[PDB]
Amino acid sequence: MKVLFRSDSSSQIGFGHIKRDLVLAKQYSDVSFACLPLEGSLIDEIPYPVYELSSESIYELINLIKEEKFELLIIDHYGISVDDEKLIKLETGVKILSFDDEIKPHHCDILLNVNAYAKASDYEGLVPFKCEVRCGFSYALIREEFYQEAKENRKKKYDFFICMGGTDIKNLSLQIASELPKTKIISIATSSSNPNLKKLQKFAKLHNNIRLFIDHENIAKLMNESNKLIISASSLVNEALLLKANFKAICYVKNQESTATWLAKKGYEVEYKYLEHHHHHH
Ligand SMILES: O=c1ccn([C@@H]2O[C@H](COP(=O)(O)OP(=O)(O)O)[C@@H](O)[C@H]2O)c(=O)[nH]1
Ligand SMILES: [Cl-]
């Protein structure tokens, strides 16, 4: 099939949707993306045709599907609703694979929840009658380096690895690093789309126990070189699970609660305080 991904990335949205979509894209031969141009997006990192959307109009997406005759639409977008999915189906007849991370209803032909917590039974009554439900770690979308890395034995170089996802809008990385002993060696990974980058670099430069890695190409290596991870309850969790890492999870935003709950149940430390509004910036 000709496949279209509808997915955004930005400083605000984070990188998780596009990054996992790029792993999924390797499953298909004729791939395109439809993206809004947004500040801090990964559009320049997407090695496929990227249709630039001029608006958030669901009809603009429908027009693109009809005109280019896409046969599979992969939706990985918290802003595309069940009603939007229904409308796409009605107007185009395209097959729809929808990502879900929170246990919400979708009108799709395949429901994909790549998170370890997820069970097909979570979606009873939440999907259409002919929907194939794909849930759990057997459907993890993880970059090759993590598989390559779970094989190698590395010497530990860091006491802690901190990664709050691609962009860390609340600057939790600074707050979290500030709580740790000055004698503990701390790696921090973030991207150049982090809107707190200048402040984080200033902070890091003052503390010789902190090593900041910007736009690092091998997060797996950094994790495997670290004794303990402190990570958001996001894509990083599946990555850490594959590497059998010791980690504490931060429930960054409400959408991460399903993962957070499961991790607590499994005996991992899970921190919820940063959900509170006074932690919106550091
Ligand atoms: O500096 C970084 C920080 C994160 N990541 C990767 O980007 C993804 C972040 O997605 P996630 O769902 O964890 O968080 P989001 O960015 O959506 O908030 C994960 O696969 C990380 O391994 C990366 O390549 N470089
Ligand atoms: Cl890959």
CSV table of C-alpha atoms and ligand atoms in Angstrom, one decimal:
chain,number,residue,atom,x,y,z
A,1,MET,CA,0.0,0.0,0.0
A,2,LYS,CA,0.7,3.7,-0.3
A,3,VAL,CA,0.8,4.7,3.4
A,4,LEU,CA,0.3,8.2,4.9
A,5,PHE,CA,1.2,9.1,8.5
A,6,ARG,CA,-0.7,11.9,10.2
A,7,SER,CA,1.5,13.0,13.1
A,8,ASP,CA,3.0,16.2,14.4
A,9,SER,CA,6.1,17.0,16.4
A,10,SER,CA,7.2,20.3,18.1
A,11,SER,CA,8.7,21.9,21.2
A,12,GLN,CA,5.2,21.7,22.8
A,13,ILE,CA,4.1,18.3,21.4
A,14,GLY,CA,7.4,16.4,22.0
A,15,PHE,CA,9.1,14.0,19.7
A,16,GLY,CA,7.5,10.7,20.7
A,17,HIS,CA,4.9,10.5,17.9
A,18,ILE,CA,7.3,11.2,15.1
A,19,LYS,CA,10.1,9.1,16.5
A,20,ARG,CA,8.0,5.9,16.9
A,21,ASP,CA,6.3,6.6,13.6
A,22,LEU,CA,9.7,6.6,11.9
A,23,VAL,CA,10.3,3.1,13.3
A,24,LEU,CA,6.9,1.9,12.1
A,25,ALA,CA,7.6,3.5,8.7
A,26,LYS,CA,10.3,0.9,8.1
A,27,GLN,CA,7.6,-1.7,7.9
A,28,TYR,CA,6.2,-0.2,4.7
A,29,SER,CA,7.7,0.6,1.3
A,30,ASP,CA,5.7,3.6,0.0
A,31,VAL,CA,5.5,6.1,2.9
A,32,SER,CA,4.5,9.8,3.2
A,33,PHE,CA,3.8,12.1,6.2
A,34,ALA,CA,1.3,14.9,6.6
A,35,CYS,CA,2.5,17.4,9.2
A,36,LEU,CA,1.8,21.0,10.3
A,37,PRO,CA,4.9,23.2,10.3
A,38,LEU,CA,5.5,23.9,14.0
A,39,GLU,CA,8.3,25.4,16.0
A,40,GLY,CA,10.8,22.7,17.0
A,41,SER,CA,9.3,20.0,14.7
A,42,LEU,CA,11.3,17.0,13.3
A,43,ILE,CA,10.2,17.7,9.7
A,44,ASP,CA,13.8,18.0,8.6
A,45,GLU,CA,14.5,14.5,10.0
A,46,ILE,CA,11.7,12.7,8.1
A,47,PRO,CA,13.3,11.0,5.1
A,48,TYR,CA,9.9,10.6,3.2
A,49,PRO,CA,7.7,13.0,1.3
A,50,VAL,CA,6.2,15.4,3.9
A,51,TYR,CA,3.0,17.1,3.0
A,52,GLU,CA,2.8,20.4,4.7
A,53,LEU,CA,-0.7,21.1,6.0
A,54,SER,CA,-1.9,24.7,5.8
A,55,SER,CA,-4.6,24.2,8.5
A,56,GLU,CA,-5.8,21.9,11.2
A,57,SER,CA,-8.9,21.2,9.1
A,58,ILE,CA,-9.8,17.5,9.0
A,59,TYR,CA,-11.1,18.2,5.4
A,60,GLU,CA,-7.6,19.2,4.3
A,61,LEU,CA,-6.4,15.8,5.4
A,62,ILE,CA,-9.3,14.1,3.7
A,63,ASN,CA,-8.5,16.0,0.4
A,64,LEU,CA,-4.9,14.7,0.6
A,65,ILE,CA,-6.0,11.1,1.1
A,66,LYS,CA,-8.4,11.2,-1.9
A,67,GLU,CA,-6.1,13.0,-4.3
A,68,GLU,CA,-3.0,10.8,-3.7
A,69,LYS,CA,-5.0,7.6,-3.3
A,70,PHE,CA,-3.5,6.5,0.0
A,71,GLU,CA,-4.5,3.0,1.0
A,72,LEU,CA,-3.5,3.1,4.7
A,73,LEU,CA,-3.7,6.1,7.0
A,74,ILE,CA,-1.7,5.8,10.2
A,75,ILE,CA,-2.9,8.4,12.8
A,76,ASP,CA,-0.6,9.2,15.7
A,77,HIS,CA,-2.1,12.4,16.9
A,78,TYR,CA,-3.8,13.3,20.2
A,79,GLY,CA,-5.7,16.1,18.3
A,80,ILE,CA,-7.5,13.8,15.9
A,81,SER,CA,-10.8,12.7,17.6
A,82,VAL,CA,-13.0,9.6,17.2
A,83,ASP,CA,-15.5,11.8,15.3
A,84,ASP,CA,-12.6,12.9,12.9
A,85,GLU,CA,-11.7,9.2,12.4
A,86,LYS,CA,-15.3,8.4,11.6
A,87,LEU,CA,-15.5,11.2,9.1
A,88,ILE,CA,-12.2,10.1,7.4
A,89,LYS,CA,-13.6,6.6,7.1
A,90,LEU,CA,-16.9,7.8,5.6
A,91,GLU,CA,-15.4,10.3,3.2
A,92,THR,CA,-12.4,8.2,1.9
A,93,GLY,CA,-12.9,4.5,2.7
A,94,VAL,CA,-9.2,4.4,3.6
A,95,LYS,CA,-7.9,1.8,6.1
A,96,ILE,CA,-7.0,3.4,9.4
A,97,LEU,CA,-4.4,2.4,12.0
A,98,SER,CA,-4.7,4.6,15.1
A,99,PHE,CA,-2.2,4.9,17.9
A,100,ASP,CA,-3.5,5.2,21.4
A,101,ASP,CA,-1.7,5.7,24.6
A,102,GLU,CA,-4.4,6.5,27.2
A,103,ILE,CA,-7.2,4.0,26.6
A,104,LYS,CA,-9.6,6.1,24.6
A,105,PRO,CA,-12.0,5.2,21.9
A,106,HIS,CA,-11.0,5.2,18.2
A,107,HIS,CA,-12.9,4.5,15.0
A,108,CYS,CA,-10.1,2.5,13.3
A,109,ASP,CA,-9.4,-0.8,11.6
A,110,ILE,CA,-6.3,-1.4,13.7
A,111,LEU,CA,-5.7,0.0,17.2
A,112,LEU,CA,-2.1,0.2,18.2
A,113,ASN,CA,-1.1,0.7,21.9
A,114,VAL,CA,2.7,0.2,22.0
A,115,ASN,CA,2.9,0.6,25.7
A,116,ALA,CA,3.8,-2.3,28.1
A,117,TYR,CA,0.8,-1.7,30.3
A,118,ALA,CA,-1.7,-2.2,27.6
A,119,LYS,CA,-4.1,-5.2,27.1
A,120,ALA,CA,-6.5,-5.8,24.2
A,121,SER,CA,-9.2,-6.2,26.9
A,122,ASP,CA,-8.7,-2.5,27.8
A,123,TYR,CA,-10.4,-1.6,24.5
A,124,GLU,CA,-13.6,-3.6,24.9
A,125,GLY,CA,-16.4,-1.4,23.5
A,126,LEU,CA,-14.0,1.4,22.5
A,127,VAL,CA,-13.3,0.3,19.0
A,128,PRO,CA,-15.4,-0.7,15.9
A,129,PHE,CA,-16.6,-4.2,15.4
A,130,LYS,CA,-14.0,-5.2,12.8
A,131,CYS,CA,-11.0,-3.6,14.6
A,132,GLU,CA,-7.8,-5.5,15.2
A,133,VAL,CA,-6.5,-4.5,18.6
A,134,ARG,CA,-2.7,-4.6,19.1
A,135,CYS,CA,-1.5,-3.9,22.6
A,136,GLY,CA,1.5,-4.3,24.8
A,137,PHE,CA,5.3,-4.8,24.6
A,138,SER,CA,5.0,-7.3,21.7
A,139,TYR,CA,4.1,-4.2,19.7
A,140,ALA,CA,6.9,-1.9,21.1
A,141,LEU,CA,8.4,0.5,18.5
A,142,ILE,CA,12.0,0.9,19.5
A,143,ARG,CA,15.0,2.1,17.5
A,144,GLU,CA,17.6,-0.5,16.4
A,145,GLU,CA,20.3,0.9,18.7
A,146,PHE,CA,18.4,-0.3,21.7
A,147,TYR,CA,18.4,-3.8,20.3
A,148,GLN,CA,22.1,-3.5,19.4
A,149,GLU,CA,22.8,-2.2,22.9
A,150,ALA,CA,20.9,-4.8,25.0
A,151,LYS,CA,23.6,-7.2,23.6
A,152,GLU,CA,26.7,-5.2,24.6
A,153,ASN,CA,28.3,-5.0,28.0
A,154,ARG,CA,29.3,-1.4,28.9
A,155,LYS,CA,31.2,0.1,31.8
A,156,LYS,CA,29.1,2.4,33.9
A,157,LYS,CA,30.1,6.1,33.5
A,158,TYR,CA,27.1,7.8,35.2
A,159,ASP,CA,25.3,7.4,38.4
A,160,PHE,CA,22.2,8.9,36.9
A,161,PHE,CA,20.8,9.4,33.4
A,162,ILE,CA,18.0,12.1,33.1
A,163,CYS,CA,15.8,12.4,30.1
A,164,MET,CA,12.4,14.1,30.1
A,165,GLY,CA,11.7,13.2,26.4
A,166,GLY,CA,12.7,15.3,23.4
A,167,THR,CA,11.8,18.8,24.6
A,168,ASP,CA,11.1,18.9,28.4
A,169,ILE,CA,9.0,22.1,28.3
A,170,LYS,CA,8.7,22.4,32.1
A,171,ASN,CA,12.5,22.2,32.4
A,172,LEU,CA,12.2,19.3,34.9
A,173,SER,CA,15.7,18.2,33.9
A,174,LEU,CA,17.2,21.2,35.7
A,175,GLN,CA,14.9,20.7,38.8
A,176,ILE,CA,15.7,17.0,39.0
A,177,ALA,CA,19.5,17.4,38.5
A,178,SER,CA,19.4,20.1,41.2
A,179,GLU,CA,18.0,17.6,43.8
A,180,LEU,CA,20.9,15.1,43.3
A,181,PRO,CA,24.2,15.0,45.3
A,182,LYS,CA,27.0,17.1,43.8
A,183,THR,CA,29.2,14.0,43.9
A,184,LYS,CA,26.8,11.9,41.8
A,185,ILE,CA,27.8,11.9,38.1
A,186,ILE,CA,24.7,12.9,36.0
A,187,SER,CA,24.1,12.6,32.3
A,188,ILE,CA,21.2,14.6,30.8
A,189,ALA,CA,19.9,14.1,27.3
A,190,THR,CA,17.8,16.6,25.5
A,191,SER,CA,17.2,18.0,22.0
A,192,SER,CA,17.8,21.4,20.5
A,193,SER,CA,14.0,21.8,20.4
A,194,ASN,CA,14.0,22.2,24.2
A,195,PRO,CA,12.8,25.8,24.8
A,196,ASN,CA,14.9,25.8,28.1
A,197,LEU,CA,18.1,24.9,26.3
A,198,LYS,CA,20.0,28.1,27.1
A,199,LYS,CA,19.2,27.9,30.8
A,200,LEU,CA,20.0,24.2,31.0
A,201,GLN,CA,23.4,24.7,29.4
A,202,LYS,CA,24.2,27.6,31.8
A,203,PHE,CA,23.2,25.4,34.8
A,204,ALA,CA,25.2,22.4,33.5
A,205,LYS,CA,28.3,24.5,32.9
A,206,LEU,CA,28.3,25.4,36.6
A,207,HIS,CA,28.3,21.8,37.8
A,208,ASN,CA,31.2,19.6,36.8
A,209,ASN,CA,29.3,16.5,37.9
A,210,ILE,CA,26.8,17.1,35.1
A,211,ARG,CA,27.3,16.1,31.5
A,212,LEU,CA,24.7,17.5,29.1
A,213,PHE,CA,24.2,15.7,25.7
A,214,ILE,CA,22.3,17.7,23.1
A,215,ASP,CA,20.8,15.8,20.1
A,216,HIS,CA,22.8,12.7,21.0
A,217,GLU,CA,22.5,9.9,18.3
A,218,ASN,CA,22.5,7.0,20.7
A,219,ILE,CA,20.2,7.2,23.8
A,220,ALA,CA,20.6,3.5,24.3
A,221,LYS,CA,24.3,3.8,24.9
A,222,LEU,CA,23.7,6.6,27.4
A,223,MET,CA,21.1,4.6,29.3
A,224,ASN,CA,23.3,1.5,29.3
A,225,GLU,CA,26.3,3.6,30.7
A,226,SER,CA,24.2,4.7,33.6
A,227,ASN,CA,23.4,3.1,37.0
A,228,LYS,CA,19.9,4.6,37.4
A,229,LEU,CA,17.6,6.4,35.0
A,230,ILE,CA,15.2,9.2,35.8
A,231,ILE,CA,12.8,9.3,32.8
A,232,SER,CA,9.4,10.6,31.7
A,233,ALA,CA,6.7,7.9,31.5
A,234,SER,CA,6.7,8.1,27.8
A,235,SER,CA,8.5,6.3,24.9
A,236,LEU,CA,11.6,6.2,27.1
A,237,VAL,CA,9.9,3.6,29.4
A,238,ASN,CA,9.7,0.9,26.6
A,239,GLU,CA,13.3,1.7,25.7
A,240,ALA,CA,14.4,1.3,29.4
A,241,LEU,CA,12.4,-1.9,29.7
A,242,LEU,CA,14.1,-3.4,26.7
A,243,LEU,CA,17.5,-2.6,28.3
A,244,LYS,CA,16.4,-4.0,31.7
A,245,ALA,CA,17.4,-0.7,33.3
A,246,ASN,CA,16.8,0.5,36.9
A,247,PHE,CA,14.7,3.6,36.6
A,248,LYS,CA,12.4,6.1,38.3
A,249,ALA,CA,9.6,7.4,36.2
A,250,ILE,CA,8.2,11.0,36.2
A,251,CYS,CA,4.5,11.3,35.3
A,252,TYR,CA,5.0,14.5,33.2
A,253,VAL,CA,1.5,15.2,31.9
A,254,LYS,CA,-1.9,13.6,32.4
A,255,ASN,CA,-1.7,11.4,29.2
A,256,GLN,CA,1.1,9.4,30.9
A,257,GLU,CA,-1.0,8.2,33.8
A,258,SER,CA,-1.8,4.7,32.4
A,259,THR,CA,1.9,4.0,32.1
A,260,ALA,CA,2.6,5.6,35.4
A,261,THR,CA,0.0,3.4,37.2
A,262,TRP,CA,1.3,0.2,35.7
A,263,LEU,CA,4.9,1.1,36.6
A,264,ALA,CA,3.9,1.7,40.3
A,265,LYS,CA,2.0,-1.6,40.3
A,266,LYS,CA,5.2,-3.3,39.0
A,267,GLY,CA,7.2,-1.8,41.9
A,268,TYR,CA,9.0,1.1,40.1
A,269,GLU,CA,9.3,4.6,41.8
A,270,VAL,CA,6.8,6.9,40.1
A,271,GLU,CA,6.7,10.7,40.8
A,272,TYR,CA,3.5,12.6,40.2
A,273,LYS,CA,4.3,16.0,41.8
A,274,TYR,CA,5.2,17.6,38.5
A,275,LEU,CA,1.6,17.4,37.3
A,276,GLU,CA,0.9,20.3,39.6
A,277,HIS,CA,0.6,23.7,38.1
A,278,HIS,CA,3.4,25.3,40.1
A,279,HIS,CA,5.9,23.0,38.3
A,280,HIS,CA,5.0,24.4,34.8
A,281,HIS,CA,8.5,26.0,34.6
A,282,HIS,CA,11.9,25.8,36.3
B,1,LIG,O1,17.7,14.1,23.4
B,1,LIG,C1,16.9,13.2,23.1
B,1,LIG,C2,15.8,12.9,23.9
B,1,LIG,C3,14.9,11.9,23.6
B,1,LIG,N1,15.2,11.2,22.5
B,1,LIG,C4,14.3,10.1,22.0
B,1,LIG,O2,13.1,10.7,21.6
B,1,LIG,C5,11.9,10.0,22.1
B,1,LIG,C6,11.1,10.9,23.0
B,1,LIG,O3,9.8,10.4,23.0
B,1,LIG,P1,8.9,10.4,24.3
B,1,LIG,O4,7.6,9.7,24.1
B,1,LIG,O5,9.8,9.7,25.3
B,1,LIG,O6,8.8,11.9,24.9
B,1,LIG,P2,8.3,13.2,24.1
B,1,LIG,O7,9.3,13.9,23.4
B,1,LIG,O8,7.1,12.9,23.2
B,1,LIG,O9,7.8,14.1,25.2
B,1,LIG,C7,12.4,8.8,22.7
B,1,LIG,O10,12.3,7.7,21.8
B,1,LIG,C8,13.8,9.1,23.1
B,1,LIG,O11,14.6,7.9,23.1
B,1,LIG,C9,16.3,11.5,21.7
B,1,LIG,O12,16.5,10.8,20.6
B,1,LIG,N2,17.1,12.5,22.0
B,2,CL,CL,15.2,2.1,13.6
